[PDB]
C-alpha cells in the first residue's frame, strides 16, 4: 500500500450524512421528515446503521447531507 497521493475531485457533500441501507422493517415505522407510516412497499424504506432511523426513499433526499446524531432511548 502507502500509495496514492492525490487525484481525486473536491469532496463536497457533508460532513456526517446518514448511511441508511435497503431493509425491511418487520413493523410499521414512522417517518422523521415526512411524519408517515411507512408501511407502502411492504414496508420497504431506508434504516440508518447509526442513528436507526426510517425514512422513504424519497424521505432521504432531504436528508441526504444532514449530519447524523440519534438519541440512545431503549
Ligand atoms: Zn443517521
Ligand atoms: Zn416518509
Same mark, same amino acid.
Given at each position: 500500500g502507502s500509495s496514492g497521493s492525490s487525484g481525486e475531485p473536491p469532496?463536497?457533500?457533508?460532513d456526517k450524512p446518514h448511511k441508511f441501507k435497503d431493509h425491511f422493517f418487520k413493523k410499521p415505522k414512522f417517518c422523521? %421528515?415526512?411524519?408517515?407510516?411507512? %408501511?407502502?412497499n411492504n414496508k420497504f424504506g431506508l434504516r440508518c446503521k447509526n442513528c436507526k432511523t426510517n425514512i422513504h426513499e424519497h424521505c432521504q433526499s432531504y436528508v441526504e447531507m444532514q449530519r447524523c446524531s440519534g438519541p440512545s432511548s431503549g
Open positions: 469532496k463536497l457533500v457533508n422523521d %421528515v415526512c411524519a408517515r407510516m411507512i %408501511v407502502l
